[PDB]
Write a protein that binds this ligand. Structure first.
Ligand code: HEA
Ligand code: HEA
Ligand SMILES: CCCCCCCCCCCCCCCCCC(=O)OC[C@H](COP(=O)([O-])OCC[N+](C)(C)C)OC(=O)CCCCCCCCCCCCCCCCC
Ligand SMILES: CCCCCCCCCCCCCCCCCC(=O)OC[C@H](COP(=O)([O-])OCC[N+](C)(C)C)OC(=O)CCCCCCCCCCCCCCCCC
Ligand SMILES: COC1=C(OC)C(=O)C(C/C=C(\C)CC/C=C(\C)CC/C=C(\C)CC/C=C(/C)CC/C=C(/C)CC/C=C(\C)CC/C=C(\C)CCC=C(C)C)=C(C)C1=O
Ligand code: CUA
Ligand SMILES: [Ca+2]
Ligand SMILES: [Cu+2]
Ligand SMILES: [Mg+2]
Lengths: 59, 254, 78, 153, 287, 57, 130, 57, 151, 49, 51
């Protein structure tokens, strides 16, 4: 999550955009696919249908 | 005997279909009812008294969601396309998690353009006004024949199952959404069941897809019209007569 | 050359602008451009007729044209 | 135009399945008589203008493909079925059914296809009132419109 | 041919080195340099180079087919003269790689005409190969199957080359994947099939033991299939219009590129089968 | 009609030719829009089949 | 080559123009060209009504706050009023213009009605099939 | 034997090229256009002058 | 085809379509122009000959349009003359087809052949003003030029 | 394998494509007389390109 | 898209096998020539099948 830098990852901004009115409207249009990850309590978890592994632990 | 019984049943079904078409045409001959504001947000349509509103022209305002539509297979003038079926949202809260609505049949769409990513436009998902004829989707639900299967999880449909469509839409008013399905219609076309013009288009398909049905198209029930049923009944009755005569000759064995 | 079909827009603002241009053109042509400034745009007349058939029919109607002329005269005087 | 051809063919099939009433049958008879007289049973090359000759020949070729060839195919299918029946019955090869049954099938299937596609052939002859063929076409169209209490192009 | 052409390539490469280091401006248009001279000199050797690569491949089939058919080869003199005519007429077609560079229409037409004329001796060789298989005592063997695969690949390769000889089509197909597919079907298909056929023909002479027919058949099948699957979709890519030497391309080529990669991996599996064939033959160690 | 009416400026605006992808998937992000000046100054028609003009000596 | 294509569809004819007043428009354009009028607005049959000043002053556009710097006769051809010769040679083309305007008015008066039933399948009557 | 080694090297270079060309976005070289061009040139030169030539001549 | 006020967030829409746009197995090039986007597309008229003078600044490049089937080698030090005649109204893309260096892959071309009227409109409204923008640039200047030079 | 499939497959495919998909025509166009023609299948996919 | 006039000339899909566009007269001629080139092989193919 947000690694290595926000300018590259942009997880939080993308999550907020998806949760915003514009994101919901775009999803309804259907051109943009549904969100693929959820921001848990300090961690990012991809959905099982995203077809990707979970991010490696930061140690 | 079996084929004679089948032909008699086909003739009875032809008469029933003719009566149904007549009554539906008479019902559609009435003016259109514009539902706005509170009425639009809470449509009067309900499974308790759906028969009252069946095949009635209603102008309703709502927010369609093309992103999660259904493509029920269908054949229209030789094109093995789909009948676009969208969850037409009527009222939603600020968050949008809880919402209610109905099912709107936009019309026939070609198979090539059926995918959302295969279209050259961004579908509008704002409030829009649609004039539709209320229908129960009898032929859509009864199509598919034997071995037909549908996978709502994969969003693949072979026949129009009202309960599965309502579950896919996810509207709170499950009973209301499952009661009936709206079909986008044009009120400026002949009200003749035998017009032979089912979708409002020209020979060049100038209109942009999906092509809304006409009143004649809504009245038409593919593969179950009275003339087709009468032709099938006549063929079955001839086959009967022939087999019965042959069996009688064999029995006589003069 | 493939041209895609699109019926008249009938947009409220666009038709209002086109109708205002049509009114200006009619006022100027009635006096034969005997005005200090010529604001008429002949190009927009075609777009008016193509995009706003309802207003075109209203103008063609003798009663609608009469009412439009009366209102335009009242507004111009006021 | 392939989309237009498919739409026209499907419309004709739907109309044929639906059937026709007295007025529709009369109009179809008039159109079929006109088409047979001026296109099918007349040498198109004998007309005056090049435009009318070419369009009449286009209509004649369309009629050929949509009526004559289709009727030949259907009658040949029926004659082949009868030939298979007779071959099974006689345990040998027979040649009589081919010509006779083929001709009978063609005679049976030509009227139905002509009725199905009568309107298209009549409409394809609308070259224009400036020519004799177009003038006769317009006269027949006016008569059909008067019969049907409607207007057609 | 190599003796004839090598000095030209050497001189061109030396001039390139001098321009790079001493800045002799041989190919700098500013003060008399001719950038197109470099291309002329390179291709003058380049086309004879590919002809040199291909010509030896024909001998493998020309030897194997008679050996297994128990029959004399068809028109050996005519095949020899055809290969010779190709060899000493390929020196006047080096400009078919430079049609669009901007050379004079006279030279362009000469190059195109000679290039299309080159097709005839290839047809002569093809008909001789076909006739060598008739009216004889056939002894089917893995070298024979490799020869058949070589013929099958060479037919399409030469046909695609002749199509490239079309000037108008060459305008669109220059520096595209169509040329890539053509010369891949030529080299990787025909030359490698002939090399493997010769290897299986001289396996006893080379390794002193007989080969393993099982892994040999596996190698043949997988190598031929991989070559076809890899280099057929490249023709579709060329027709679509994909340029060459590009690592990132429009999304519309994903399917054919995946097919090409699959074909390459099948060819790699065939190579694995060839190496396993050698290992199993040495394990068998049978006279 | 190569121009589009704008609800903000109450005028017709146009942009240089753009690909279908840009027009469809980036309609909300447009730049270089300029007011439509008209095909001709007086409003006449420029719709003619052009040919090749006589050569220069 | 000789018969490489193996067939030619000579039957396919040149598509016939089906416009209402094409002949009238072309005749009027030919007459206007014979009039040798430098102005182009005269191409439209209703020029005397769309540009009234074209006969008296010629000022068709308001050149306010904009420079006017002609360099030859081809700069502001639309700013030159018609002369006696132009007026004469355009009056010599009045019958064609009147016929064209009458055809346009007839087309305008023609309107779509629910009576028409072949509107959808009008391409066959328009002769779009070949 | 040397030709076998060189052919394996050429096959490896071809595999690199095919993996890079599998789908757009440079999954293999990840944007190294110069490296891709060098690999392509190496593949071509090795296959031409150091596989077929050593095998035949 | 109307420029309406956007109630959404344009930046949010742009970011979302950049990140998680929906694609398909069979998507046309028109809807998939990832590596075929440029600016200031070259606009030409249709149904007329044009003399294209091709040249290069540094090294040899290739002006390639597969839709038209045109390939012109732009060689430094040369002014090669070619005939260009697009017999239809259409928009064509292209990619350079000769090794040039770093951005050999990403170097697209966009050529739009339009009817002469549309081409002349585009000229007068975008290119003709720029030919004097080097010295004179103003709305009044552009209006004066377009009125003075009317076709 | 050799003759009939290779000489009839492409034509069958093109005929079926015209039957069921209108040779891939893009609809929503105007005045077919002025509109361009969407050609039927002409590139032999069975023949190695 | 120059207005409602769709100027795009190429609509090739992911697995396109033919030319990108067929509007160009050169490409039309090339396609027809290739088609008839493939046509003119009946006797040769039959002979090779028989042998
Ligand atoms: C072994 C290698 C090899 C061989 C043998 C050939 C053989 C031929 N080549 Fe090719 N060629 C290359 C390797 C080869 N080439 C390479 C590597 C390039 C690109 C170099 C680069 O730029 O990197 C190239 C580029 C190239 C071009 C330039 C394309 C372009 O840049 O746009 C041309 C143009 O005509 C061409 C033509 C020919 C011709 C006419 C033959 C003739 O010899 C072929 C004659 C044979 C036939 C014509 C066969 C006849 C067919 C049959 C009998 C079967 C018929 C059956 C059916 C039709 C079903 N070659
Ligand atoms: C002999 C020449 C030859 C051979 C065999 C090959 C074989 C292959 N080539 Fe290559 N290629 C070229 C010569 C060759 N190529 C040339 C000259 C260019 C132009 C470069 C440029 O213009 O920049 C090129 C360009 C080129 C490109 C274009 C890259 C780009 O432009 O971006 C690609 C793309 O996939 C490619 C792929 C392949 C593949 C998958 C094979 C497969 O066939 C590879 C599989 C492996 C083999 C075929 C050999 C295996 C060897 C053995 C098993 C040993 C055998 C030993 C004995 C029998 C004793 N090649
Ligand atoms: C000495 C050897 C010489 C080898 C020479 C090289 C040969 C290369 C070609 C090999 C072809 C092999 C056969 C392929 C059959 C493909 C059929 C197909 O999909 O239809 C294509 C075509 C394509 O039709 P289409 O309508 O789908 O068109 C393609 C798609 N559109 C519409 C978009 C264009 O269809 C037909 O031909 C229809 C009739 C087919 C009838 C025969 C079916 C055979 C099925 C397979 C065999 C039977 C199964 C068991 C086999 C057991 C074998 C041991
Ligand atoms: C001195 C030079 C010759 C005189 C000047 C002419 C030179 C330029 C033209 C020559 C080539 C013409 C090719 C036309 C296209 C057909 C190609 C073709 O079918 O090839 C495949 C054919 C074989 O392929 P095929 O077996 O598929 O043949 C077609 C089979 N059917 C019909 C069943 C589909 O190759 C030939 O043998 C064709 C020879 C050319 C055509 C000759 C037909 C007879 C007409 C009289 C010829 C007299 C000789 C002079 C030429 C006539 C004009 C003067
Ligand atoms: C008119 O008719 C004609 C035409 O028109 C149709 C023509 O086009 C033509 C032109 C055709 C040609 C010139 C020939 C074209 C090419 C042809 C026919 C061949 C193409 C063949 C294919 C595409 C098939 C694909 C090839 C393959 C090898 C597929 C292999 C498949 C499978 C399942 C095997 C997978 C196995 C592996 C990857 C290896 C796994 C195993 C191991 C590693 C070892 C295991 C070992 C242990 C011990 C367990 C002709 C001649 C014609 O007559
Ligand atoms: Cu510039 Cu490649
Ligand atoms: Ca890549
Ligand atoms: Cu060469
Ligand atoms: Mg090049």
């Amino acid at each position: 999550l947000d690694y290595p830098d926000t300018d590259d990852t942009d997880d939080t901004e993308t999550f907020k955009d998806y949760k915003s009115f514009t994101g919901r409207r775009m999803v309804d249009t259907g051109i943009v696919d549904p969100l693929w990850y959820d921001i848990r309590e300090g961690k990012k978890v991809y959905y099982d249908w995203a077809g990707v592994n979970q991010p490696m632990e930061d140690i | 005997i079996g084929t004679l019984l089948y032909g008699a049943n086909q003739s009875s079904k032809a008469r029933e279909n003719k009566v149904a078409t007549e009554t539906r045409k008479e019902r559609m001959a009435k003016p259109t009812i514009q539902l706005t504001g509170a009425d639009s947000q809470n449509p009067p349509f309900t499974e308790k008294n759906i028969n009252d509103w069946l095949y009635k022209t209603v102008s309703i305002t709502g927010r369609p969601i093309h992103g999660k539509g259904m493509m029920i297979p269908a054949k229209s003038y030789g094109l093995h396309g789909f009948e676009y079926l969208v969850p037409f949202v009527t009222k939603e809260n600020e968050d949008g998690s809880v919402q209610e609505g109905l099912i709107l049949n936009l019309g026939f769409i070609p198979r090539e353009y059926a995918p959302i990513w295969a279209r050259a436009r961004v579908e509008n998902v704002e409030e829009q006004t649609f004039t539709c004829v209320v229908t129960d989707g009898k032929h859509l639900s009864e199509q598919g024949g034997l071995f037909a299967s549908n996978k709502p999880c994969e969003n693949q449909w072979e026949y129009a199952d009202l309960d599965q469509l309502a579950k896919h839409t996810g509207f709170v008013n499950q009973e209301q959404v499952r009661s009936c399905i709206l079909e986008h219609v044009n009120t400026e076309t002949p009200n003749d069941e035998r017009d032979c013009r089912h979708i409002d288009i020209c020979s060049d398909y100038k209109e942009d897809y999906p092509y809304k049905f006409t009143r004649s198209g809504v009245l038409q029930q593919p593969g179950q019209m009275y003339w087709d049923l009468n032709k099938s009944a006549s063929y079955y009755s001839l086959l009967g007569l022939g087999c019965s005569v042959f069996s009688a000759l064999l029995f006589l064995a003069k | 050359m493939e041209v895609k079909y699109r019926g008249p827009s009938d947009d409220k603002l666009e038709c209002e602008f086109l109708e205002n241009n049509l009114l200006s053109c009619l006022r100027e042509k009635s006096v034969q451009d005997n005005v200090a400034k010529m604001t008429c745009r002949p190009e927009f007349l075609v777009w008016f007729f193509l995009e706003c058939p309802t207003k075109a029919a209203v103008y063609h109607d003798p009663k609608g044209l009469r009412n439009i002329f009366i209102q335009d005269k009242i507004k111009q005087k006021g | 135009s392939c989309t237009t051809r498919r739409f026209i063919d499907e419309k004709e099939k739907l109309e044929y399945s639906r059937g026709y009433n007295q007025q529709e049958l009369e109009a179809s008879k008039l159109r079929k008589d006109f088409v047979k007289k001026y296109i099918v049973d007349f040498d198109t090359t004998l007309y005056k203008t090049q435009v009318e000759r070419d369009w009449a020949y286009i209509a004649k070729r369309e009629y050929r493909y949509e009526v004559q060839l289709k009727s030949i195919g259907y009658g040949g299918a029926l004659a082949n079925a009868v030939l298979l029946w007779r071959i099974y019955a006689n345990k040998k090869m027979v040649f009589w059914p081919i010509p006779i049954v083929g001709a009978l099938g063609y005679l049976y299937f030509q009227p139905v296809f002509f009725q199905k596609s009568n309107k298209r052939f009549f409409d394809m002859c609308n070259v224009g009132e400036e020519y004799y063929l177009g003038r006769e076409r317009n006269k027949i169209l006016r008569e059909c419109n008067k019969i049907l209490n409607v207007e057609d192009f | 041919m190599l003796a004839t052409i090598t000095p030209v390539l050497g001189a061109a490469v030396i001039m390139m080195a001098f321009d790079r280091h001493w800045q002799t401006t041989f190919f700098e248009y500013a003060y008399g340099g001719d950038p197109i001279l470099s291309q002329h000199l390179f291709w003058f050797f380049g086309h004879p180079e590919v002809y040199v690569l291909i010509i030896p491949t024909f001998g493998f089939i020309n030897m194997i087919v008679p050996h297994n058919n128990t029959r004399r080869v068809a028109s050996k003199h005519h095949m020899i003269w055809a290969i010779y005519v190709m060899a000493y007429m390929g020196y006047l077609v080096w400009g078919h790689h430079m049609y669009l560079v901007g050379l004079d229409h006279r030279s362009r037409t000469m190059y195109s005409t000679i290039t299309i004329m080159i097709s005839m001796p290839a047809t002569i060789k093809v008909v001789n190969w076909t006739l060598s298989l008739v009216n004889g005592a056939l002894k089917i063997d893995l070298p024979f199957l490799f020869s058949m695969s070589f013929l099958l690949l060479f037919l399409v390769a030469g046909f695609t080359g002749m199509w490239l000889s079309h000037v108008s089509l060459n305008v669109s197909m220059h520096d595209t994947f169509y040329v890539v597919a053509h010369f891949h079907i030529m080299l990787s298909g025909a030359a490698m099939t002939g090399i493997f056929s010769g290897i299986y023909y001289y396996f006893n002479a080379l390794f002193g033991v007989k080969y393993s027919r099982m892994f040999g058949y596996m190698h043949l099948i997988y190598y031929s299939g991989g070559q076809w699957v890899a280099f057929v979709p490249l023709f579709y890519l060329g027709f679509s219009g994909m340029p060459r030497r590009i690592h990132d391309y429009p999304v519309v080529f994903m399917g054919w590129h995946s097919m090409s990669t699959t074909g390459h991996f099948i060819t790699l599996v065939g190579i694995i089968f060839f190496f396993l064939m050698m290992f199993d033959s040495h394990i068998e160690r049978r006279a | 009609k190569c121009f589009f009416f704008d609800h903000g400026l109450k005028k017709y605006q146009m942009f240089e030719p753009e690909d279908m992808y840009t027009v469809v998937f980036e309609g909300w992000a447009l730049d270089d829009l300029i007011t439509f000046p008209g095909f001709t100054p007086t409003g006449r028609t420029n719709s003619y089949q052009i040919g090749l003009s006589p050569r220069q000596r | 080559a000789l018969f490489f294509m193996a067939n030619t569809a000579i039957s396919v004819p040149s598509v016939l123009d089906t416009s209402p007043c094409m002949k009238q428009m072309l005749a009027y354009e030919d007459c206007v060209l014979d009039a040798n009028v430098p102005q182009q607005e005269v191409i439209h049959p209703q020029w005397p009504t769309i540009w009234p000043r074209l006969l008296t002053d010629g000022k068709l556009l308001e050149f306010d706050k904009v420079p006017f710097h002609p360099e030859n006769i081809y700069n502001y051809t639309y700013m030159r009023p018609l002369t006696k010769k132009n007026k004469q040679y355009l009056y010599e083309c009045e019958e064609e213009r009147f016929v064209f305007k009458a055809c346009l008015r007839k087309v305008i008066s023609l309107k779509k009605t629910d009576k028409h039933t072949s509107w959808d399948t009008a391409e066959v009557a328009n002769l779009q099939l070949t | 034997y040397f030709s076998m080694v060189t052919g394996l090297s050429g096959a490896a270079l071809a595999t690199m090229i095919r993996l890079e060309l599998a789908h757009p976005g440079s999954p293999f070289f990840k944007g190294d256009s110069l490296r891709y061009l060098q690999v392509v040139t190496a593949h071509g030169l090795i296959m031409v002058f150091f596989v077929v030539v050593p095998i035949l001549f | 085809k109307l420029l309406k006020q956007s109630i959404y967030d344009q930046t949010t829409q742009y970011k979302l379509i950049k990140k998680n746009k929906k694609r398909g197995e069979l998507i046309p090039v028109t809807l998939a122009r990832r590596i075929l986007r440029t600016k200031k597309t070259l606009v030409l008229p249709a149904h007329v000959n044009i003399t294209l003078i091709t040249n290069s600044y540094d090294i040899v490049h290739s002006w390639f349009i597969p839709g038209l089937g045109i390939k012109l080698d732009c060689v430094p030090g040369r002014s090669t003359h070619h005939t260009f005649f697009i017999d239809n109204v259409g928009f064509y893309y292209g990619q350079c087809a000769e090794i040039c260096g770093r951005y050999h892959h990403h170097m697209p071309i966009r050529v739009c052949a339009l009817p002469f009227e549309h081409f002349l409109l585009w000229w007068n409204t975008f290119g003709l003003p720029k030919m004097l923008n080097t010295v004179s640039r103003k709305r009044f200047e552009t209006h004066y030029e377009l009125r003075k030079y009317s076709w | 394998i050799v003759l009939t499939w290779g000489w009839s497959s492409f034509q069958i495919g093109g005929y079926n494509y015209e039957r069921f998909d209108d040779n891939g025509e893009r609809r929503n166009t105007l005045y077919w007389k002025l509109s361009p023609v969407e050609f039927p299948q002409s590139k032999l996919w069975n023949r190695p390109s | 898209m120059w207005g409602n006039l769709w100027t795009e000339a190429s609509y090739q899909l992911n697995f396109n096998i033919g030319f990108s566009s067929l509007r160009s007269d050169v490409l039309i001629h090339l396609a027809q020539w290739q088609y008839w080139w493939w046509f003119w092989f009946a006797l040769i193919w039959s002979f090779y099948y028989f042998i």
